[PDB]
Amino acid sequence: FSGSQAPYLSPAVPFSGTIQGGLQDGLQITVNGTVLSSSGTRFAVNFQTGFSGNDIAFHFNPRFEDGGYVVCNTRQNGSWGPEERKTHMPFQKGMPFDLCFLVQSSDFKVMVNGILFVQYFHRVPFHRVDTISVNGSVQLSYISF
């Protein structure tokens, strides 16, 4: 590791932890782990304000359902917005993955196993994000910065 916040090593799922200094343009956050085989049909990574879960700037939510698709959304003052759905599944049940979020001024760039998968254009100010959560059908090796 060569970043500036110590990695969360082998974090238990569900996980919620502080992002030191908050999201910043240029910050890269990696979630590295394995999708579980028979422990649910969904997982999510949430970039959120505090630990309540009612204000999530970016919810990245693969669903092994209806062919496999990924939901991208924002929750503000407790309410979900209109979902962006990509109708391709880049993960696989039982399989290891490397999931990398690069914060840019206009969007998150989301890379799955070294391929840019989606760009989520910010709906709310990313500076207000100070917490990352991961939940659902995954086990994690690390979350790094």
Ligand X SMILES: CC(=O)N[C@@H]1[C@@H](O)[C@H](O[C@@H]2O[C@H](CO)[C@H](O)[C@H](O[C@@H]3O[C@H](CO)[C@@H](O[C@@H]4O[C@H](CO)[C@H](O)[C@H](O[C@@H]5O[C@H](CO)[C@@H](O[C@@H]6O[C@H](CO)[C@H](O)[C@H](O)[C@H]6O)[C@H](O)[C@H]5NC(C)=O)[C@H]4O)[C@H](O)[C@H]3NC(C)=O)[C@H]2O)[C@@H](CO)O[C@H]1O
Q: How far is the CB of 42 from ligand X (least distance, A)?
A: 5
Q: Which residues, including other chains, have CB under 8 Å from residue 17's CB and lie 6 or more apart? A: 8, 11, 131, 132, 133, 143
Q: How far is the CB of 110 from ligand X (least distance, A)?
A: 15
Given the complex with ligand X, which of 25 and 83 has the nearer CB atom? 83
CB of 61 to ligand X, least distance (A): 5
Q: What is the Cα 103 distance to its own chain's centre?
A: 12
What residue ranges bind ligand X (CB under 6 A)? 14, 42, 44, 46, 53, 59, 61, 71, 73, 80, 83, 135-136
Annotated binding residues for a beta-D-galactoside, written as ranges, equal 46, 59, 63, 73, 80-86
Closer of 30 and 131 to ligand X (Cβ) = 131
- Biggest alpha carbon distance in the chain? 40
